[PDB]
């Protein structure tokens, strides 16, 4: 690893600007992020899901390759996400998630982690500044 990050920290969700908080959780090998009014579309035969992250600032659309579908006994769909964590970026897979109790819109499970290099210092919040 290069960096040691905390258990939480912004993140951006650079297609539209969107900065989160992000859980670092090393518990989970997936990423998460809530995601509504999910369709599926296809360009040159490539499948690409668009969907809805909804904020306390409105609604954020993006369309985002769909790479599978896991099983969290509920199957969801898996979809690349281009993330920014302090000054690194990294196209990583994120599952869309139903749920909308939670404190943090996004999760970041190992192999997110592992993307950025980093370990996770649950001491810690906010490194990135």
């Not at 599952?95 to 649950?122: E, H, M, Q, S």
């Amino acid at each position: 690893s290069n960096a040691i990050y905390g258990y939480v920290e912004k993140a951006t969700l650079i297609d539209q600007n969107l900065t989160l908080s992000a859980k670092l959780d090393t518990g989970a090998k997936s990423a998460s992020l809530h995601a509504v009014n999910i369709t599926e579309i296809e360009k040159k035969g490539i499948p690409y899901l668009r969907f809805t992250v909804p904020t306390k600032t409105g609604d954020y659309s993006f369309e985002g390759e769909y790479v599978g579908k896991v099983k969290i006994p509920i199957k969801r769909p898996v979809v690349l996400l281009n993330i920014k964590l302090g000054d690194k970026v990294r196209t990583i897979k994120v599952n869309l998630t139903n749920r909308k109790r939670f404190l943090y819109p996004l999760l970041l499970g190992r192999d997110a982690i592992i993307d950025f290099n980093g370990a996770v210092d649950p001491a810690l919040t906010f490194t990135t500044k």
